Structure formats: structure tokens, C-alpha cells
Amino acid sequence: MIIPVRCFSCGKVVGDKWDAYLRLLEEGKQEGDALDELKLKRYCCRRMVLTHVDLIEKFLRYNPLE
Amino acid sequence: AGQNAIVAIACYSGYNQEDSMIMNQSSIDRGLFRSLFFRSYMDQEKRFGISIVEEFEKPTRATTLRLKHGTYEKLDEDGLIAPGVRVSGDDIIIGKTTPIPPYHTKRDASTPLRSTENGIVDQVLLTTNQEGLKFVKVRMRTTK
Amino acid sequence: DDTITTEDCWTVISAFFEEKGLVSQQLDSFDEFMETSIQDLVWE
Amino acid sequence: REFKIFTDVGRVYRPLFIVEDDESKDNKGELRITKEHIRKIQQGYDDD
Amino acid sequence: EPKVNIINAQDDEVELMLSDVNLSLANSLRRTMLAEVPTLAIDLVEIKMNTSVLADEFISHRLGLIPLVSEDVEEMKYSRDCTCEDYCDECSVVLELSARHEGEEGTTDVYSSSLIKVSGPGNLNVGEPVRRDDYDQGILLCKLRNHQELNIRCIAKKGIAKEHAKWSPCSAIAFEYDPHNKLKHTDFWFEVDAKKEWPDSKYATWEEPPKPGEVFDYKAKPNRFYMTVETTGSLKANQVFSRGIKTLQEKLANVLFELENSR
Amino acid sequence: GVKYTCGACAHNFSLNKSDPVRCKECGHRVIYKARTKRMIQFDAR
Amino acid sequence: KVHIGKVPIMLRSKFCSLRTLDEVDLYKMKECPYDMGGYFVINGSEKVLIAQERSAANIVQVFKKAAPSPISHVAEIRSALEKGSRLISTMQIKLYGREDKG
Amino acid sequence: NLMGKRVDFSARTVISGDPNLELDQVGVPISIAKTLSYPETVTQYNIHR
Amino acid sequence: IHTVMREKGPKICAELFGNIQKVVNYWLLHNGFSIGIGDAIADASTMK
Amino acid sequence: LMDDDPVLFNRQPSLHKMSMMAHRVKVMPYSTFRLNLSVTSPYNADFDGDEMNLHVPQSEETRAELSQLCAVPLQIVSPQSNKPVMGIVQDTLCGVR
Ligand SMILES: [Mg+2]
Ligand SMILES: [Zn+2]
Ligand SMILES: [Zn+2]
Ligand SMILES: [Zn+2]
């Protein structure tokens, strides 16, 4: 839905690196290189950031009820 | 429809034998596999004759009889609970009264919450059915 | 030219699913029922 | 010695590639589809 | 007798070598950092008005995991240690968030920097959300469309990771010893050769490899432990280490006092 | 009497158990109850 | 023109209202673009018609009967009119008499 | 055709393993234990508890 | 188990299960055991 | 319901007489029944979501009958093939090997 605040396994704060990750992917950098530039060493954080689905962008398409 | 979890295949303490697993409690505390549960209840008025119809209203203690042991203070003046209200099991969420066919002569057709379920009133819908009678749908949200 | 590779087959399958979809049979059956079956059933 | 033609409703079918089998050209034994068809599919339109 | 060697030291993580101590002491110290170091985390959320697409419990739980500056968390008291009704200024920190999006276009991103410390036990240096830099927005909390508003009041209290993982001040604690398997504490699975099929530890160069003609030293015990401690920014790594040592000391002192009073 | 919101034009109005169930502005037949003003508390766990 | 009834509409078909209007208008009326259709809405409930298996019609099928029966082989056809593809009648042919029996 | 009685002398639920239990022991949830009941007759020995 | 049942009695036989389980479970907890993909791989000679 | 109270315990289907046995209650938190591993084999059950039934005796005769006839230790040896039906299994078996 939205990027989780912390890594599920270890607990590193990864919720502040989503915009940076997307911007790094904008310049055509590979996903592994982008993850490396964010200092995500353990693969728990790597799967936390890499496999996330930003579903909230769909939820914001619907017109608000108020 | 799932999540990528770090799995270790090991005989740690014998608590995962015969098709069972040990879950990291801290991972649960961080949001792993947490989910929302939505359940919707429905209620509509029905017509018995020329004007013999039910109504969504808050039942009274004196003029209305057959009161369930569940609480009624959570209902509003129109018998519909406002969204964003914590309730527990057996609580009345829809209050409907039916006149007795020929004071203290009103059947209570109130719909209570499931006794084994809790949650918050996520949404309330009021509308009219095909024939024009009242129609209410209450969606409850809880966290598993 | 060159031999057809596996990614070519995946391109073909992607084109198939882009044109048809996953519930194509239901929609096609209902469309042919509404477009032709009703009129002929009336005219019989 | 039977020749059957079916135009019924409800038959289940699947698509398959067509391998050239006419013993009158060098294309025999090879897939009819070429890289040109793949290029046209990727483009989304034919070259007139 | 115990000796400490700091290999790498920065604000958020510290990698060090710990020598002349027993294995159980190092493991207990690691567990103390992981679980029993008190920090400050949001524990009560009062939602005045929420119009976003996220559920109330969803945004509340996301707010719970936000790290908070807990440098002076020691001077605060637990909720059950305070005689005040509910919560007061000496046992909690009151923060507030108010976000809205204006106009028919665009989407407003609500970050953790929008959280403002309304009140706290002054003049203690606690309650402020952790910011990497002055310009860093921080953790993405929510997203708002047109005519969507969020108005939340949050209460932060002192706790430990035992109660809930949100008070944990550390993310991961790397911990290892005996890189060359001299003590034979583990048996290496292999297909052809064990040495070629197993990667060398990152500390393999810190200890000399065993000679081929060496005999097993049955009287040897683990003595050097390499450990790296990473924090979430709530507490600096040196503060985490010192407070873990202090917590273990206080626990042992409490046990000693109970033993003395038992007579 | 009780606040309500339209399901189509999202206009807030009020009803007094006598008006027909319809939006005052756009005449929509689907309406929702407005959110209660009472505070709600969560443990953030 | 005379009204003779109302026929339920399968969603996302050629007669459904959601076939056109694109993602913007699909969002504008609380409809998920990822939805695929292929189902009806009856009294507000989403109903789907499971495909029904049946034997082919207008073809000849020959089977061998069981041992404890005078009939040895049965050749049968289920004739159905092409117009409407509705089963009309079932006709069978049976070879009475087991081998060296009857 | 019969109705009307209050019987709650049975339960049914999912199970899990526990290595720290004896062979003749069964773990019971506190809620299930509170739901069920056993009628004990008051004597002189057991009156206090 | 059969010998203990026939010799000592049901109580001792029941306690034997718990004793053995506790000892073995503690040792396995502090020893470790696992299975992996490499356990299903044979060498080149056996494959040949 | 308290500790050491004999209760009858069953799995459906009850094909054999030791599919239903009398156990001693231990009250513990959370919402699952807990069993020893070795009694899962006679029950022919696994922890993949299977459900179990429990009954409580309501008299002294029933309690004595459960404790003296249907007790778990008395069911270790079965008359079907005069051999034990409960044994060390799974992690304990691997660890003891
Ligand atoms: Mg099972
Ligand atoms: Zn991680
Ligand atoms: Zn206070
Ligand atoms: Zn309207």
C-alpha cells in the first residue's frame, strides 16, 4: 500500500528512502546500484524496498467522498 | 497476495514440529502479515399493507418492548450508529421497530453485532431500495 | 533473418493477452447471444 | 477415409504455431513466423 | 582485565572488538542492547479528524514506528511510576500533526517532519522526531488528495523493546567470534572440500590462520568477539552501548539488593 | 437533525427524519452518514 | 416499440456501460480499472455462470456393454437441432445377444 | 421437535505442539477454561479455597 | 518403551517420554539441525 | 476448569478406542489446545489447522472412570497388535539419533 516505516526482519528505518530510490531509478541506474547507493547492505532491507508495491497511488485516483 | 519473509529451515526448540512454524514476534510488531477485516450488515424496512411499515429508530424503554440485553446508547436519534465508534459484540448497530397488527406494542427487530467480533464503524450507507423503502448498510472495520 | 527465440514467444503471448484478455470466452458468448441469438429466437 | 468439418458451439481449442510442410520450397521444416512478424507486433502496425 | 578496541566509529553505527570477556557476558550485553534499553515512542494516538484513504489504525501504527530523540529519556518516568491521573507533562510528550491539501491538482506528501513537539518535560531534550539532516523530510507518513485532511494528536511515552518492538533502539547487531573455527564450535557442511566451499569471514585477516601441523587446543575458549551496533537515530551508538551496560548493572544490583533484603 | 453527505456530489447537508432519502443539491439517491465528532483513541501497536 | 422485459447485462461486454470511457471515467464512477468483468449483478450480488460440461451432439458413439447383460454393444447418438443447439431426442442402437448367447 | 436448554459442557478448537508438556497433559486456553465449569460439592476440607 | 511398560508401569512409562523429550530437545536446541538444497545433489561420478 | 482436572479429548474420526483419551488440564494463555508430540501419532493428527473436541465430566463417578480407565498412560500399549502405539517421533527422534 505504502512504503513500510521499518524493515520487518532487522528494523532499519527504510521509509525515508522511497523517494530517493524512485529518483535514482529515474536516471536509469540499475536496481542493485540504486539499493547500494542507499546503503542497504543486508538483503532484508533490500527485499523490503525492492518488492514494495505502491498501491496508494491507485487509491488516490478515486474522488474523495467529502 | 503475500509477503517475502526471511525463512530459516531448522529444528530450533521443538515448537515447530508436525506442520507448525515459529514467527518472529518483533516482525509481527513491525507490521508483518497484519491485515484489515471488513464486514457489512444490511437492513431494510418492509411493508405489510397500506401503511403498516417498519422504521429505523432508537427504541424506547417504555413505549418499545422486547429490548435485547445489548446496549442501545450508541444509536442515534434515527437508529443508525455514526461511523468511527468503537463497539463490542452483541451491541446494537441498527435499530428497527415493527408495529403490532391488531404504546408498548412495537416489536424490536434490531440487528446486533456478532458476539464474537469487534471493531469500529467504518462506514454507514443510507438509501432506498427498488420499491422506495429505507435501506441501510453498515460496514465494520477491524484489525487482525 | 534469425531463429525464433523464447522472448519472441513471450512477445506473441503478450500480444495474445493484450488482444483477448483472460475472460474473453464469457464476453464473447454474451455478445454473440445479445447481438444475434435474441433476434433469431424471436424470428423463428 | 473420412473428412469432418465442425462449426459447432462450445468446442475447446488452443492456438499453435504453423510449421511449413510443403515440399516445394526451402522453408519446409521451419517456423512460418519470422522476426518480421515480431517486429510488426512490437511496432503495433504493419508497414503498409 | 576486559579490553575494548573500537574499529570504526560514526554517529549511527559502531564496529568494535571485545576481548578478555566471557561469551555469555557478550551475548547478554547484545541482548540488553536489543531489548532492554529504554527509549521514547508514540503509544497513544487521538485522531481528531481523518479523511485520508488510510485506515485510522493503519496511520496510528505507522506513527508508532517513527523514531524519536531519546537522549534524555532516563530522567523521565514510566506511566505507572507517575501519580498523576492519565498522563502529565513529567511522564509523556505531546506532539501534534495537521496536514491538508489545497487545490484540485497535485498530491501532498505528509512526512515525519510535520510532527511538532507541542509539549514535553522541559527542559529535557526528548520528543523531537529524528532527522538525518536539517533539510531531510524524513519518513513518509501519508499522502493526501484534494479536500483530504489529517488532524492527529499523539502521546509519546518511555518503554523497552520487550513490550513492543517500536521502542527498540537498534536495528541489527552483527556479532561473531573465532573466524577460523579454531575452537571447532561448528562442523562445516561440504561436498568436496570444506575450505574452498565456504567464504572467508570479514575478520579472517584479524587472526592468523591455523598451521597445517597444529594440534587441537582443547583448553581454549572464545576470547575475542567482533560486533557492530547500528541504531535508528533515536540514540547514538556510544549512548546505546553505555546505557546497555548501565541497564545490566542496574539489573544485577537489583538482584543483589533483593538477596540482601531476603535475610 | 443528523448530518449526511451525498454519494455523488459530496455535499454535506442535514436530515430531520421527514425528508425523502435524496441529496438536496444533485438529487442523488445514495447518501452516507457524516463522521462523528467524538475523539477516538488508539494504542499505536 | 413495446417493452417485453429487461435482460441482465454482463459487465464489460459490448452492451455494458463500462466498455468505453477509459480509466479516467472508470475512476470517476468508483470502478476499478483492473476489474475484468464477465459476471452479472443480480440484486446487488455478483453472480458468475460456471461453464457446463456436456457430451457432443449429432455424433455417433459406440460402447461395449457390461458382462451381465444380454446387450453386447450399444451405438447411440444424441440428435440436437442446430438452430439453438438444444437437445431434442435421444436415439440408440443395441446389439442384443452376448457372444454365443441368446 | 424440542428446544430450550443451556448446555456448555464441550469445546472444539485448533491445536499445536508443546514439547514442555507431559504425555497426559493438555494445554487449555484461559477463555476456554472460564467458559467450561465443574460442579463441586462443598465439604469441610475444600470450603476455604 | 514396551520394556518399561511391562516392567515398571504406566506412570514410569509416561514419565520416560517427557524425560527423553526434554533432554533431546535441549541438546538439539544447543546443537542445531537443518536441511538444504545441497543435500539433494550428487557428485559428478555418481551422476555419470 | 482447573489444573489436573481429568477431561476427555477426541479427534474425528474416532476409528479406534485410543482416539479418545483422558488428559490432565494445564491452563495456559493464547487460543490453541496444546498436546505432547508423542500423542499426535495415536490421534493421527497434525498441526496444519486440525480441530479437536473436549468434554468435561460432571460427576465423581465419571471423573474416577476417566482417571482409572481412559487415562493416557494406560493407552500406551494397544490390544490390536500387543505393541506400543506411542513413540519418540520427529525432532526428538532425530536428536536422539
Ligand atoms: Mg491436518
Ligand atoms: Zn533489514
Ligand atoms: Zn505524569
Ligand atoms: Zn449530491
Side-chain angles (χ1 to χ4, degrees):
Chain A
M1 181 165 318
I2 198 168
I3 190 67
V5 184
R6 286 161 171 245
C7 180
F8 287 151
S9 308
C10 76
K12 179 185 180 66
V13 168
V14 308
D16 51 352
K17 308 176 165 57
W18 178 246
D19 63 358
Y21 175 63
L22 280 183
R23 174 191 42 83
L24 278 179
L25 284 185
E26 182 65 26
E27 295 101 12
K29 277 170 188 280
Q30 214 262 337
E31 280 135 27
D33 306 336
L35 288 169
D36 282 343
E37 293 187 25
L38 297 170
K39 316 301 282 304
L40 293 186
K41 317 194 314 304
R42 299 179 299 280
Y43 50 86
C44 54
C45 313
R46 299 180 83 85
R47 59 88 174 173
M48 281 275 318
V49 161
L50 189 144
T51 50
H52 168 241
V53 180
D54 212 28
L55 271 169
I56 191 162
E57 291 307 314
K58 306 300 192 295
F59 300 152
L60 296 185
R61 301 307 307 280
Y62 300 98
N63 282 322
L65 290 75
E66 171 36 34
Chain B
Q3 283 173 346
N4 303 291
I6 313 297
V7 186
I9 306 192
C11 305
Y12 199 47
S13 44
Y15 269 88
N16 63 340
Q17 311 171 74
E18 196 86 69
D19 274 345
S20 55
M21 54 200 60
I22 288 153
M23 181 146 288
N24 195 325
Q25 172 60 40
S26 294
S27 300
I28 287 177
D29 297 353
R30 278 165 195 137
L32 182 81
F33 281 125
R34 210 173 290 203
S35 64
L36 292 151
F37 180 69
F38 299 96
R39 177 182 280 278
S40 296
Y41 309 88
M42 201 265 298
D43 212 6
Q44 60 183 328
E45 311 184 351
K46 64 212 81 163
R47 158 157 275 115
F48 299 93
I50 304 169
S51 77
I52 302 169
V53 295
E54 316 168 316
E55 198 189 355
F56 294 127
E57 53 171 310
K58 188 168 177 167
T60 75
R61 260 67 192 166
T63 76
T64 300
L65 74 173
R66 194 53 250 182
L67 284 177
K68 317 277 210 301
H69 201 75
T71 77
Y72 290 83
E73 69 267 0
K74 278 154 171 168
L75 294 182
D76 272 346
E77 48 172 330
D78 47 1
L80 306 183
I81 187 167
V85 171
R86 270 219 179 80
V87 310
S88 298
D90 209 11
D91 279 0
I92 305 298
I93 43 170
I94 296 92
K96 200 174 55 167
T97 64
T98 308
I100 287 295
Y103 321 103
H104 209 260
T105 44
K106 270 177 151 291
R107 290 301 304 282
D108 165 81
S110 299
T111 293
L113 183 63
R114 178 70 275 172
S115 56
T116 66
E117 302 197 18
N118 311 317
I120 318 165
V121 187
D122 189 66
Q123 205 164 90
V124 178
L125 165 72
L126 170 60
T127 181
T128 60
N129 47 18
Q130 176 51 76
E131 67 271 8
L133 308 176
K134 269 190 182 194
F135 196 90
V136 294
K137 270 173 168 171
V138 182
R139 190 180 67 199
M140 295 299 291
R141 163 183 35 91
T142 179
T143 300
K144 291 184 183 292
Chain C
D1 266 330
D2 203 359
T3 53
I4 290 305
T5 57
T6 313
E7 58 166 33
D8 303 330
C9 311
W10 289 123
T11 288
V12 162
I13 292 178
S14 302
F16 170 88
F17 277 131
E18 195 268 350
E19 170 168 314
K20 287 210 150 194
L22 284 152
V23 285
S24 73
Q25 66 274 349
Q26 310 263 324
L27 305 177
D28 282 349
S29 188
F30 185 75
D31 287 336
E32 69 91 18
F33 157 72
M34 287 292 271
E35 261 172 7
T36 313
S37 302
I38 283 182
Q39 187 57 79
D40 293 18
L41 202 43
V42 163
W43 274 348
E44 68 93 19
Chain D
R1 293 180 296 258
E2 286 191 6
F3 177 44
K4 315 165 98 79
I5 298 168
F6 276 102
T7 69
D8 276 1
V9 61
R11 286 169 308 116
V12 182
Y13 57 87
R14 57 193 197 112
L16 279 187
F17 281 143
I18 303 172
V19 165
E20 183 41 82
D21 63 358
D22 201 350
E23 199 43 60
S24 58
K25 53 184 63 59
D26 50 354
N27 209 21
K28 207 262 194 182
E30 310 170 13
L31 285 178
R32 275 210 190 173
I33 184 168
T34 73
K35 316 281 304 190
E36 293 321 290
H37 306 77
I38 305 302
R39 201 199 80 261
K40 290 178 193 172
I41 282 288
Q42 290 164 334
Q43 278 174 6
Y45 62 98
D46 204 338
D47 280 286
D48 205 73
Chain E
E1 192 80 23
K3 311 189 296 185
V4 185
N5 187 8
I6 290 176
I7 298 172
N8 290 115
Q10 60 204 43
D11 192 80
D12 61 324
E13 67 182 1
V14 164
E15 154 190 3
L16 58 91
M17 191 215 308
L18 183 63
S19 52
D20 283 325
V21 292
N22 294 324
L23 164 69
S24 66
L25 192 141
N27 183 55
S28 285
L29 189 55
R30 163 195 84 97
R31 289 173 59 101
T32 295
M33 271 156 268
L34 274 180
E36 293 179 353
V37 171
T39 52
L40 196 78
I42 282 177
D43 194 38
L44 194 69
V45 163
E46 306 202 358
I47 291 178
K48 298 160 182 175
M49 183 278 288
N50 185 1
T51 46
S52 89
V53 308
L54 300 185
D56 294 349
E57 52 253 22
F58 197 99
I59 179 65
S60 80
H61 164 249
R62 276 185 74 79
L63 273 166
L65 297 174
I66 305 283
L68 271 76
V69 165
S70 311
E71 186 203 76
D72 287 332
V73 69
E74 322 179 273
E75 279 79 3
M76 298 188 27
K77 316 179 303 297
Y78 287 76
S79 186
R80 44 91 170 161
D81 290 327
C82 203
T83 71
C84 84
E85 57 90 20
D86 212 345
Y87 48 86
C88 84
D89 203 23
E90 310 157 354
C91 58
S92 64
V93 176
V94 186
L95 294 99
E96 275 175 0
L97 187 135
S98 190
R100 55 176 293 111
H101 178 58
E102 294 179 354
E104 214 74 31
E105 90 285 357
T107 294
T108 294
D109 295 11
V110 194
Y111 291 104
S112 77
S113 297
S114 302
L115 275 175
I116 184 66
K117 177 189 181 193
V118 161
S119 89
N123 206 19
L124 265 57
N125 179 39
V126 294
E128 291 275 339
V130 178
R131 282 132 47 80
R132 303 182 298 173
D133 309 306
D134 63 358
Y135 64 91
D136 196 28
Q137 290 86 17
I139 304 174
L140 172 68
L141 266 183
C142 192
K143 286 185 191 179
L144 295 175
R145 211 207 172 173
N146 177 35
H147 292 130
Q148 274 169 358
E149 202 169 319
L150 194 66
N151 184 25
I152 308 189
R153 179 156 164 277
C154 317
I155 310 299
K157 300 198 172 171
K158 180 174 73 175
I160 59 180
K162 263 186 168 184
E163 198 165 0
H164 194 267
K166 78 194 178 193
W167 292 271
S168 183
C170 315
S171 76
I173 302 194
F175 177 86
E176 84 173 271
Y177 72 99
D178 188 25
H180 290 299
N181 202 26
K182 283 161 149 191
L183 321 170
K184 292 187 166 60
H185 270 173
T186 186
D187 201 25
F188 275 125
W189 189 95
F190 67 95
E191 317 177 63
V192 171
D193 188 284
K195 210 169 308 302
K196 323 291 190 251
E197 288 173 21
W198 274 96
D200 294 354
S201 162
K202 85 186 282 187
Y203 301 108
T205 70
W206 292 72
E207 290 182 19
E208 48 160 29
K211 288 168 293 302
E214 270 185 347
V215 302
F216 182 67
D217 192 8
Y218 45 81
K219 73 202 75 64
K221 287 181 172 175
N223 201 36
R224 314 170 79 188
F225 318 93
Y226 317 91
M227 41 189 310
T228 306
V229 178
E230 314 179 16
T231 71
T232 63
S234 54
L235 284 160
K236 297 192 309 161
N238 63 275
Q239 306 170 322
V240 175
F241 202 74
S242 293
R243 281 164 204 222
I245 290 176
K246 192 60 194 170
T247 288
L248 193 61
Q249 269 179 340
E250 286 177 341
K251 183 197 300 280
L252 287 148
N254 167 74
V255 176
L256 190 81
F257 155 73
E258 275 285 332
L259 266 189
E260 288 182 348
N261 191 34
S262 176
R263 319 167 85 83
Chain F
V2 178
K3 299 172 185 179
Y4 281 89
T5 57
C6 168
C9 79
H11 183 269
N12 175 272
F13 54 88
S14 301
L15 289 178
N16 46 3
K17 81 170 286 298
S18 51
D19 291 331
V21 184
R22 58 168 290 278
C23 164
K24 312 280 193 57
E25 305 290 322
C26 83
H28 202 54
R29 306 309 172 102
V30 164
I31 56 181
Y32 302 109
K33 282 201 62 172
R35 187 187 177 80
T36 188
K37 181 69 176 177
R38 306 309 201 253
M39 281 325 98
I40 181 64
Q41 283 193 331
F42 295 95
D43 53 357
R45 280 191 176 150
Chain G
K1 306 177 185 180
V2 192
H3 179 252
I4 68 163
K6 313 179 186 148
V7 160
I9 298 311
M10 170 178 298
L11 278 72
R12 299 295 182 96
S13 67
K14 270 175 176 174
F15 289 84
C16 171
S17 305
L18 311 175
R19 172 62 82 90
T20 57
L21 281 72
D22 204 74
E23 292 181 354
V24 180
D25 308 331
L26 269 186
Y27 281 127
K28 265 202 173 167
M29 43 191 46
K30 321 295 190 47
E31 216 71 31
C32 177
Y34 286 121
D35 198 9
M36 70 303 279
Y39 53 94
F40 304 94
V41 172
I42 308 301
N43 298 327
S45 184
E46 293 160 325
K47 301 272 190 176
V48 58
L49 284 169
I50 310 299
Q52 286 319 296
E53 171 46 4
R54 77 177 160 84
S55 284
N58 312 326
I59 61 152
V60 189
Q61 290 210 116
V62 178
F63 306 110
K64 304 210 302 187
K65 213 52 179 178
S69 164
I71 313 160
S72 79
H73 306 71
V74 182
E76 62 192 307
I77 187 167
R78 303 143 41 74
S79 191
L81 291 174
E82 175 210 324
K83 185 64 64 67
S85 193
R86 46 183 169 106
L87 173 61
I88 304 301
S89 60
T90 298
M91 182 295 278
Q92 281 175 108
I93 295 193
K94 324 200 192 89
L95 176 50
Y96 274 117
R98 198 60 61 173
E99 182 182 3
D100 311 344
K101 170 134 184 169
Chain H
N1 264 314
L2 202 58
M3 73 291 291
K5 208 52 75 193
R6 312 299 169 211
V7 295
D8 49 353
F9 303 159
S10 160
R12 162 176 194 89
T13 197
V14 72
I15 55 170
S16 62
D18 207 324
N20 300 318
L21 282 185
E22 295 314 300
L23 197 78
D24 49 349
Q25 277 197 314
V26 54
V28 170
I30 316 170
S31 60
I32 296 280
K34 272 146 56 175
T35 300
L36 304 152
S37 64
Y38 171 70
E40 203 174 357
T41 302
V42 180
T43 80
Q44 57 176 355
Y45 317 102
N46 67 335
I47 189 165
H48 193 80
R49 62 173 183 87
Chain I
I1 289 159
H2 199 181
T3 298
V4 173
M5 191 55 267
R6 298 311 303 162
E7 270 296 322
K8 296 299 194 180
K11 191 186 174 75
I12 316 295
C13 193
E15 291 179 354
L16 170 82
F17 280 87
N19 298 166
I20 288 182
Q21 277 174 192
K22 279 164 179 75
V23 176
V24 170
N25 280 340
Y26 183 85
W27 184 88
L28 198 58
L29 166 60
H30 279 78
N31 176 78
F33 180 59
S34 173
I35 193 169
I37 176 66
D39 304 295
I41 306 186
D43 52 59
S45 79
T46 310
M47 271 305 327
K48 280 182 185 179
Chain J
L1 200 65
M2 286 181 183
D3 279 357
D4 282 311
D5 287 347
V7 293
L8 209 53
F9 210 92
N10 183 26
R11 187 191 182 269
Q12 271 80 16
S14 309
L15 303 176
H16 54 85
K17 95 168 188 154
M18 72 291 291
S19 287
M20 191 165 217
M21 281 175 289
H23 299 237
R24 307 188 287 121
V25 164
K26 183 190 176 43
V27 164
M28 64 184 73
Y30 306 103
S31 65
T32 54
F33 287 163
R34 271 81 155 185
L35 286 187
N36 205 14
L37 271 298
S38 296
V39 300
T40 61
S41 306
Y43 279 145
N44 191 31
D46 44 356
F47 313 128
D48 55 354
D50 290 6
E51 270 186 358
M52 294 298 290
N53 310 331
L54 182 136
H55 312 265
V56 176
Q58 300 286 294
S59 88
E60 297 288 342
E61 301 66 20
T62 47
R63 268 171 57 114
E65 283 187 352
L66 292 193
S67 67
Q68 300 303 293
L69 300 185
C70 308
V72 164
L74 301 172
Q75 308 298 320
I76 286 170
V77 160
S78 168
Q80 161 184 21
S81 298
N82 63 36
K83 58 189 275 299
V85 288
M86 298 165 199
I88 300 304
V89 289
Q90 296 255 329
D91 281 4
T92 318
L93 190 43
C94 188
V96 73
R97 186 255 176 201

